Amino acid sequence: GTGYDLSNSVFSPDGRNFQVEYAVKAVENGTTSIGIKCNDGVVFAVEKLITSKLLVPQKNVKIQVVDRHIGCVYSGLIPDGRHLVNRGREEAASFKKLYKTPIPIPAFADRLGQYVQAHTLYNSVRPFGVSTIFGGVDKNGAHLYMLEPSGSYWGYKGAATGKGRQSAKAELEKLVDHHPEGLSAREAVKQAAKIIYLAHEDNKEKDFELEISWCSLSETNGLHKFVKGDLLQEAIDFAQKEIN
Template sequence: MKAVENGGTSIGIKAKDGVVLAVEKIINSKLLVPGKNKRIQTIDRHIGVAYSGLLPDGRHFVNRGRDEALSFRSTYKTPVSLPHLMDRLGLYVQNYTCYNSVRPFGIVSIVGGVDDNGPHLYMIEPSGAYWGYTGAATGKGRQTAKSELEKLNFEELTVREAVKQAARIIHQAHEDNKDKDYELEISWCSLEETGGKHEFVPEELLQEAIQYAQEDDEEEEEEDTEMAN
């Protein structure tokens, strides 16, 4: 869990019309190419995952999820449901805690998507245990992120609004890592906005969300200054 607790913050938001995933990807070197080593990946057309912790473990988890989704689709000729996928992945992750020849996964993953029953959001831990959420957070800034998520009205929140809120929350949670630069990744999945497909938000919307987060941070600083005076 140390790898998770010291990793960049990841959050998931289940809005009324879809899900939003966001990740604070810490930039440890100026030599890294922007946009590479993404922490948000697609498992199936309608399912995405964000994770905090060890990058190789995250890739292995995603590949296993893709194998499960492909196996289900080839057998039943229909896309896998997220609850079924989580059952399978939960068992797989839990198996890595049962034998001394392997170690547990060094990640906590937030998995979200949409199907005929609406949006779904889950978080799965290294133990293999998972729960359904309306808002989930993991990583170094998880406590700050959870506090901000609890203030949201998920029943009225749209995915477009959730994108802005996700950027704001990640920006606030970054205070725990403020000595390092970070790159913001945000994806969404919505029947209305993306046709049920999990994909990264358009660059224009991403920049709009980043600007919203920065302006909100400036307003809070001004309020704190006024109160101090």
């Protein structure tokens, strides 16, 4: 028959949920965001399209902090990403309250995944429209995860989602091949700036602003912090050199 793509949680004769795939398309329509796991932490980066010079630069932050050690950046429908980040913050607060210890990165990943999978379980709720790359440093070291609107989430050496996800994935594969020992935190920041600058060329019609955060056991003592000032400009210059 027909009509399997009009209601959420409805399995097509193939075994698919078409509304989830449409949400994935909505994600693919979003900007490019990447995460890079280094030897002692993770680095998140995102492109912010400067639709007009009326936008206040360095403001309109896109990377959200969870607890004090988790970083999250979502590609797709930004409001849905904020909803998911708020839910994750509530989950982290609950975990810390009950077990005192801060929530581990895998636990947080599974919480977000179960939330999204529940959102893919009823025809009364729309699937999420954001792919979220998140992670941080816990007692077991660095962790980088990516979660899709289907509720599927995995741990990554490097992850990327958005319009320029393919070029970013190729550059991340190059980085993984050329660095088996692992990247350093600042090297990961420079590579994230480079990959963001390289993926902007797909939509070079309008100028963009780079936003980078990192959580490193040595560089930030395990806390999620926004890369700003001298390091951000250094990464921007590194990328500008790398393009040409």
